[PDB]
Design an enzyme around this catalytic site. Structure first.
Site, PDB file in Angstrom:
ATOM      1  N   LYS A   9      -0.173   8.880  -4.399  1.00 28.18           N
ATOM      2  CA  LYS A   9      -0.783  10.060  -3.768  1.00 28.18           C
ATOM      3  C   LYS A   9       0.166  11.208  -3.507  1.00 28.18           C
ATOM      4  O   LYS A   9      -0.228  12.359  -3.607  1.00 28.18           O
ATOM      5  CB  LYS A   9      -1.405   9.693  -2.426  1.00 28.18           C
ATOM      6  CG  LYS A   9      -2.654   8.840  -2.513  1.00 28.18           C
ATOM      7  CD  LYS A   9      -3.094   8.350  -1.135  1.00 28.18           C
ATOM      8  CE  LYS A   9      -4.209   7.351  -1.267  1.00 28.18           C
ATOM      9  NZ  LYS A   9      -4.679   6.880   0.063  1.00 28.18           N
ATOM     10  N   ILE A  53       0.840  -1.187   0.000  1.00 32.33           N
ATOM     11  CA  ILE A  53       0.000   0.000   0.000  1.00 32.33           C
ATOM     12  C   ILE A  53       0.884   1.250   0.000  1.00 32.33           C
ATOM     13  O   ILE A  53       0.591   2.234  -0.681  1.00 32.33           O
ATOM     14  CB  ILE A  53      -0.942   0.062   1.204  1.00 32.33           C
ATOM     15  CG1 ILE A  53      -1.989  -1.038   1.107  1.00 32.33           C
ATOM     16  CG2 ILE A  53      -1.684   1.416   1.256  1.00 32.33           C
ATOM     17  CD1 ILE A  53      -2.693  -1.301   2.422  1.00 32.33           C
ATOM     18  N   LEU A  62       0.389   2.809  -3.626  1.00 33.65           N
ATOM     19  CA  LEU A  62      -0.738   3.739  -3.554  1.00 33.65           C
ATOM     20  C   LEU A  62      -0.367   5.047  -2.879  1.00 33.65           C
ATOM     21  O   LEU A  62      -0.577   6.121  -3.433  1.00 33.65           O
ATOM     22  CB  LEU A  62      -1.919   3.073  -2.861  1.00 33.65           C
ATOM     23  CG  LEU A  62      -2.454   1.800  -3.558  1.00 33.65           C
ATOM     24  CD1 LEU A  62      -3.613   1.195  -2.810  1.00 33.65           C
ATOM     25  CD2 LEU A  62      -2.902   2.076  -4.976  1.00 33.65           C
ATOM     26  N   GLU A  63       0.241   4.973  -1.708  1.00 40.42           N
ATOM     27  CA  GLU A  63       0.610   6.202  -1.021  1.00 40.42           C
ATOM     28  C   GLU A  63       1.662   6.995  -1.814  1.00 40.42           C
ATOM     29  O   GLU A  63       1.618   8.228  -1.827  1.00 40.42           O
ATOM     30  CB  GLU A  63       1.089   5.930   0.401  1.00 40.42           C
ATOM     31  CG  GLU A  63       0.066   5.254   1.292  1.00 40.42           C
ATOM     32  CD  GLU A  63      -1.280   5.948   1.312  1.00 40.42           C
ATOM     33  OE1 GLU A  63      -1.399   7.048   1.875  1.00 40.42           O
ATOM     34  OE2 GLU A  63      -2.246   5.374   0.768  1.00 40.42           O
ATOM     35  N   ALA A  64       2.593   6.295  -2.475  1.00 42.48           N
ATOM     36  CA  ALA A  64       3.550   6.943  -3.404  1.00 42.48           C
ATOM     37  C   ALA A  64       2.860   7.625  -4.608  1.00 42.48           C
ATOM     38  O   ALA A  64       3.309   8.636  -5.111  1.00 42.48           O
ATOM     39  CB  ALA A  64       4.539   5.925  -3.886  1.00 42.48           C
TER      40      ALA A  64
END
Ligand SMILES: *[C@@H]1O[C@H](CO)[C@@H](O[C@@H]2O[C@H](CO)[C@@H](O[C@@H]3O[C@H](CO)[C@@H](O)[C@H](O)[C@@H]3O[C@@H]3OC[C@@H](O)[C@H](O)[C@H]3O)[C@H](O)[C@H]2NC(C)=O)[C@H](O[C@@H]2O[C@@H](C)[C@@H](O)[C@@H](O)[C@@H]2O)[C@H]1NC(C)=O
Ligand SMILES: *[C@@H]1O[C@H](CO)[C@@H](O[C@@H]2O[C@H](CO)[C@@H](O)[C@H](O)[C@H]2NC(C)=O)[C@H](O)[C@H]1NC(C)=O
Ligand SMILES: CC(=O)N[C@@H]1[C@@H](O)[C@@H](O)[C@@H](CO)O[C@@H]1O
Ligand SMILES: *[C@@H]1O[C@H](CO)[C@@H](O)[C@H](O)[C@H]1NC(C)=O
Lengths: 261, 247
Positions: free
Chosen positions: B163, B155, B159-161
């Site tokens: 964002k 994640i 995903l956070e990267a």
């Protein structure tokens, strides 16, 4: 969702050389002027924003004092502006009177300088960070080939070098007047060329000019709004040691940058 | 499907994958003053998932279903098996990984939920090239003891990267220096506040770019910087897309 519609917010406003927008001597009289002053907690440096497009300190409204450029910005009674459409602030931090198009400007850097309503030329004297955190942001600036921007040649030039966490010269102080300053010498600013024959980006003594205002856009560029250009790696070749100002194009990756703080 | 494999994991390839991911997520996005794209919303379930393939050091692959409304993982497939979070959209199993043996993971796709169940926090979970490779293996075999912590890795690295460029960059330093890292307060601040920053950006539309409330983002010196407006480069040149929050 009532949090989609905030009623108000009290904050500070910083800008040139990291000084704050301040009602001189906390005077409340209509037309009491506004100046640069060193940032603090005082009420005269506290600006409350509302949906009506007013910006207020000491219960009175920030405002221009003339249609023509060159007159002071002041606080005056808010009931005077009930038929006015107020202030507008661009993404860039240009605070503009909606009606007259005049912008909050600081014609000198020095504390106690009178803020005036001037014609927008996108100069650093005309860039402002609305926000309580008024300090410069220290960071590295990373571009092409995952390399860092570094101040070179006794802080006169700038170009990409391999990123080294320790390296002092790869740090940059992001000021509230949209200037990008050498971190351990904050009188020096990153500057588009002053010589017409060159597009080379360099480092010069901060002067509040158009050359020295930089906007970190969400699309990943470092834009000079006044010159309608952006920072770029010459020929997309980091080994040329030249950073230049170019028209935005999607041809290479040389116009893409990231802030690492 | 968009793809990232261990055999070709380089700073350039990682950066491309994250770039293509962002733009794939932001198809049909809305845009504010700030110019930060806002993810789609009230999307039909049939169209609400983006598939991404991750291939590890063995030549083995998982396919992850990303909910395009919020850039979180909803489910994944390993071979003829698939695994869904409890809080996946309730109809999701009828749209994705239809022809597989479907299992429910008995926890939510949130960090809180993952950390409670795995007994292990992000701060103490290493991120890096080889952790990512191992996180893919544990998901492929579905080693229940390693599923949570594997999701913490993936994640964050995917995903956070996507964002936050800060986070992307954090992973790139790791690939180049060949050094693992655990996320500090800087990284965590972002992860923690993505939805809140989305809200304040959209709400600020009517207060000349000023937020209703302040958000504390740490830098790499652990100094908290208060972001109460859209005029911070650590937000505007960082956060790559927002959650839909306001009209
Ligand atoms: C930053 O702003 C302040 C506030 O405006 C500036 O000062 C003011 O300076 C005016 C000159 O621009 C002063 O007006 C003068 O008043 C005398 C009274 O005898 C008059 O004889 C002069 O002709 C002049 O007249 C004005 O005439 C036009 C009228 O509309 C107006 O009402 C008259 O005042 C003004 O009094 C003064 N205001 C106050 C409250 O301080 C300030 O300008 C700097 O300081 C002033 C005091 C003056 O010494 C200037 O030489 C000097 O620039 C300005 N600061 C700077 C550094 O630019
Ligand atoms: C923005 O500028 C306009 C024009 O300079 C200002 O509108 C004037 O307001 C003054 C005082 O209230 C009146 O005497 C004038 O008649 C108005 N002129 C026009 C052209 O409408 C306005 O006050 C300024 N507003 C702010 C917030 O600075
Ligand atoms: C607390 C207070 O009123 N401070 C103000 C300060 O903010 C500034 O306006 C100064 C100008 O010389 O006058 C006072 O010292
Ligand atoms: C999962 O989230 C749902 C909301 O979708 C909820 O009501 C529940 O409390 C959460 N479960 C766990 C185990 O965290």
């Amino acid at each position: 969702n009532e949090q989609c519609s905030p009623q108000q917010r009290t904050t500070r406003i910083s800008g040139r050389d990291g000084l704050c927008v301040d009602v001189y001597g906390a005077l409340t009289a209509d037309g009491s002027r506004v100046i640069l002053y060193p940032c603090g907690q005082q009420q005269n440096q506290q600006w409350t924003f509302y949906p009506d497009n007013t910006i207020r300190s000491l219960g009175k409204c920030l405002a221009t004092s003339a249609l023509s450029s060159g007159s002071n910005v002041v606080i005056t009674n808010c009931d005077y502006l009930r038929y006015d459409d107020g202030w507008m602030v661009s993404s860039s931090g240009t605070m503009m009177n909606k009606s007259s198009h005049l912008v909050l400007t600081a014609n000198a850097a020095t504390s106690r300088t009178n803020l005036t309503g001037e014609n927008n030329v996108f100069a650093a004297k005309q860039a402002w960070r609305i926000g309580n955190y008024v300090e410069p942001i220290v960071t590295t600036i990373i571009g092409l080939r995952h390399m860092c921007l570094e101040a070179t040649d006794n802080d006169t030039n700038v170009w990409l070098e391999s990123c080294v966490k320790n390296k002092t010269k790869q740090y940059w102080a992001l000021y509230s007047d949209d200037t990008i300053r050498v971190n351990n010498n904050r009188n020096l600013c990153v500057s588009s060329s002053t010589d017409s024959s060159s597009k080379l980006i360099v480092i010069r003594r901060c002067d509040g000019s158009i050359n020295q205002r930089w906007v970190f856009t969400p699309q990943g560029t470092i834009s000079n709004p006044g010159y309608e250009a952006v920072m770029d790696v010459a020929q997309n070749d980091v080994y040329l040691k030249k950073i230049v100002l170019s028209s935005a194009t999607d041809k290479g990756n040389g116009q893409q940058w990231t802030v690492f703080y | 499907n968009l793809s990232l494999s261990q055999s070709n994991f380089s700073a350039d390839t990682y950066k491309s994958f994250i770039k293509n991911l962002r733009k794939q997520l932001t198809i049909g996005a809305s845009y504010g003053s700030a110019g930060i794209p806002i993810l789609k919303h009230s999307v039909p379930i049939c169209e609400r998932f983006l598939l991404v393939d991750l291939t590890n050091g063995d030549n083995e692959t998982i396919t992850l279903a990303i909910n395009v409304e919020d850039a979180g993982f909803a489910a994944y497939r390993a071979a003829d098996r698939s695994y869904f979070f409890q809080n996946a959209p309730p109809i999701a199993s009828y749209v994705i990984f239809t022809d597989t043996n479907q299992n429910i993971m008995n926890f939510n796709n949130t960090f809180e939920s993952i950390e409670i169940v795995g007994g292990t926090t992000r701060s103490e979970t290493p991120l890096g090239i080889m952790h990512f490779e191992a996180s893919i293996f544990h998901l492929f075999v579905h080693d229940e003891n390693y599923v949570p912590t594997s999701f913490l890795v993936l994640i964050q690295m995917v995903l956070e990267a996507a964002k936050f460029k800060f986070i992307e960059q954090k992973v790139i330093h790791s690939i180049m220096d060949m050094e693992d890292f655990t996320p500090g307060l800087a990284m965590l601040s972002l992860e923690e506040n993505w939805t809140q920053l989305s809200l304040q950006l959209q709400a600020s539309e009517s207060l000349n770019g000023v937020f209703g409330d302040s958000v504390s983002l740490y830098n790499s010196m652990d100094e908290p910087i208060g972001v109460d407006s859209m005029y911070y480069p650590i937000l505007t040149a960082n956060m790559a897309f927002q959650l839909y929050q306001c009209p």
